[PDB]
Motif scaffolding. Sequence first.
Motif, mmCIF file in Angstrom:
data_model
loop_
_atom_site.group_PDB
_atom_site.id
_atom_site.type_symbol
_atom_site.label_atom_id
_atom_site.label_comp_id
_atom_site.label_asym_id
_atom_site.label_seq_id
_atom_site.Cartn_x
_atom_site.Cartn_y
_atom_site.Cartn_z
ATOM 1 N N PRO A 10 53.524 54.600 39.125
ATOM 2 C CA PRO A 10 52.335 55.081 39.827
ATOM 3 C C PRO A 10 52.388 56.599 40.073
ATOM 4 C CG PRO A 10 53.814 54.192 41.405
ATOM 5 C CD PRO A 10 54.395 53.850 40.045
ATOM 6 N N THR A 11 53.367 57.266 39.470
ATOM 7 C CA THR A 11 53.507 58.708 39.596
ATOM 8 C C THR A 11 52.395 59.418 38.811
ATOM 9 O OG1 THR A 11 54.996 58.754 37.686
ATOM 10 C CG2 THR A 11 56.020 58.615 39.848
ATOM 11 N N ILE A 12 52.134 60.670 39.170
ATOM 12 C CA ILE A 12 51.107 61.475 38.517
ATOM 13 C C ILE A 12 51.487 61.680 37.056
ATOM 14 C CG2 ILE A 12 49.857 63.644 38.528
ATOM 15 C CD1 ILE A 12 49.382 61.959 40.974
ATOM 16 N N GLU A 69 57.702 67.017 50.369
ATOM 17 C CA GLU A 69 59.131 67.298 50.451
ATOM 18 C C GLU A 69 59.612 67.190 49.011
ATOM 19 O OE1 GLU A 69 61.800 64.371 52.277
ATOM 20 O OE2 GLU A 69 63.235 65.968 52.680
ATOM 21 N N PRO A 70 60.449 68.132 48.556
ATOM 22 C CA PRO A 70 60.944 68.073 47.171
ATOM 23 C C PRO A 70 62.143 67.140 47.059
ATOM 24 C CG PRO A 70 61.879 69.963 48.225
ATOM 25 C CD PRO A 70 60.881 69.376 49.225
ATOM 26 N N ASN A 71 61.884 65.840 47.161
ATOM 27 C CA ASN A 71 62.937 64.827 47.100
ATOM 28 C C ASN A 71 62.516 63.713 46.151
ATOM 29 O OD1 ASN A 71 60.830 63.976 48.934
ATOM 30 N ND2 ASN A 71 62.200 62.393 49.731
ATOM 31 N N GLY A 72 61.558 64.014 45.272
ATOM 32 C CA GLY A 72 61.072 63.041 44.309
ATOM 33 C C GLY A 72 59.791 63.523 43.647
ATOM 34 N N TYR A 73 59.297 62.804 42.635
ATOM 35 C CA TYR A 73 58.041 63.174 41.971
ATOM 36 C C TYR A 73 56.816 62.658 42.743
ATOM 37 C CZ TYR A 73 60.412 64.523 37.608
ATOM 38 O OH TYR A 73 61.223 65.115 36.669
ATOM 39 N N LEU A 74 55.679 63.290 42.484
ATOM 40 C CA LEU A 74 54.419 62.943 43.130
ATOM 41 C C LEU A 74 53.838 61.675 42.548
ATOM 42 C CD1 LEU A 74 54.609 65.541 44.559
ATOM 43 C CD2 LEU A 74 52.361 66.210 43.658
ATOM 44 N N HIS A 75 53.249 60.841 43.404
ATOM 45 C CA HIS A 75 52.603 59.611 42.963
ATOM 46 C C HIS A 75 51.093 59.629 43.304
ATOM 47 C CE1 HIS A 75 52.857 58.422 47.155
ATOM 48 N NE2 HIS A 75 54.176 58.353 47.117
#
Length: 536
Positions: free
Chosen positions: A285-287, A28-34
Amino acid sequence: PTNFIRQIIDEDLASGKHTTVHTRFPPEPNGYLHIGHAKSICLNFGIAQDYKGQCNLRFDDTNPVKEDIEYVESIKNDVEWLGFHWSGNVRYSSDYFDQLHAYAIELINKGLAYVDELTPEQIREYRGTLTQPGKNSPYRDRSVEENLALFEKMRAGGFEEGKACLRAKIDMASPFIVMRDPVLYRIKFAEHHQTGNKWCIYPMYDFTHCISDALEGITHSLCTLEFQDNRRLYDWVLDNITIPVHPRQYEFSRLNLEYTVMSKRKLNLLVTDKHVEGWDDPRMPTISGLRRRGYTAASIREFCKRIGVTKQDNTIEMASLESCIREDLNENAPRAMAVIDPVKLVIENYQGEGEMVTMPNHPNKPEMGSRQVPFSGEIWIDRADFREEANKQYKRLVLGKEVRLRNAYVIKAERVEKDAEGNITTIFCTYDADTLSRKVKGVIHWVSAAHALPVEIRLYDRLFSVPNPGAADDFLSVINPESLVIKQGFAEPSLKDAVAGKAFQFEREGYFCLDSRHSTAEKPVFNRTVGLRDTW
RNA sequence: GGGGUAUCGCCAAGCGGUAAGGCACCGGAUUCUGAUUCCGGCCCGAGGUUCGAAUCCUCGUACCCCAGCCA
Ligand SMILES: Nc1ncnc2c1ncn2[C@@H]1O[C@H](COP(=O)(O)OP(=O)(O)OP(=O)(O)O)[C@@H](O)[C@H]1O
């Protein structure tokens, strides 16, 4: 690398139930990937390429209110940076709003959906509890015609938010709370980042996911454990509409990492309240956060490979992650010299200055060649590598004893000088002119002070003081005050040719990389990816 | 109430026939990085079926998830 899911796939491929595998990663585009999403990415894209199938990137943009365009951009960036490629164009659940709407109409015509007018509070009271069954809504029995008219009314914007919703008609007494007439559509007068203001009614996750999978020809939709109950609704929707395929869902346990938080809401909070520089702060801990910290896409894929795929709740130790990055950098990172805690060491026995020693770019890989490092009389060493008096365990520099400089001669401590605080301001010494190529046990790194390069070093540590920060009442009150500590030091000259992305291994210290966000043409900034394994 | 889980540092093979591997930790060898590399150390409970059970059955216990018009 096998797991219960790949075994399920092999079986289907064997039984002939499928002749191709098609997976998807639906963020879901509601934050960055971790790093948690990374596990899902490796699992889904990895299975696709291993079985010569396809894997789609589908933004599950069903809730406009908490989603932003900024996130779709960074998510694509990270999936690519990780080395994966999706099949075809980027997809969006919102690409199916018209079909979803048509499917809702099909359910209504079959008497399997209806417009409910129970208030948001009332729906909770009618839902029942974990131990008590729910009760039918007073509106549950409207006729098809009436529901059709009322749902069109919702689409047209005739109802205010919360004044009406389309619900599936299933069983209010199901032990599965999710099957107690789940909401299919809700009213939201919010602009959507893909469809703008064309819709004021938006489909819920359970209705949207399975149909989106079906339309795209997904064969195995992989998600986490929290959706095991949902699988029943996933199947109910597909079993009750006219659609030619029925993708099957299989759930695995999400990744949890010690000393950090993985929930998007908590990571967002850290960013919003400015406790970290941004979603990509090197401590996140994001990518993007791991990238800026110095982690390689390869190390992360290795990590995801090592932790496995099962249905067991787990919390992997940071040591497991760090191990992967060390292994990666210990084989591909060129070795260098730098001092984080500088202290002058004058070799009074050295004649003036000016010299150049040949230092290997990797003590185990000559193929990486060698650089030309300068050596003079006044050099810099780390304060931690010298002590006036220390046990036989201390293999460093001590007054009486003599040490070996990295790829250089063998100096011997003589005298020391302190200030009005007892702090050693300079260490005088002498050396053995013939030791280029007794029993001096010990070796330390150094940086010729004449050819020295001023450099800022950033040492990072766990973001939180406790193993499970997410379990604390206030995870913020458990943040580690020393997660970031800036140091001023000196590094050999060949370190000004450092470019954001390249990882060096400051001997005896660890692996570092240039931090473009702070590195200036004047003063370079190096992020410490991870320390070297240290134990006497 | 329903869904899941358990190979006792953290992960995790196993699918009725002598319990893998990784990380961590602990020893030793090499070493001009206290690194690296290379050796070595390491079946939730109770019954039941079975010649034989981590694997099948029964009953427990512990933990996670579900009562959003979030995903
Ligand atoms: N920690 C994780 N480990 C493995 N997969 C994850 C993890 N977190 C989310 N996923 C999965 O990645 C895919 C995309 O997740 P999504 O974009 O919905 O973020 P999310 O579910 O809000 O994550 P979180 O709940 O951690 O904030 C989904 O299948 C989701 O279940």
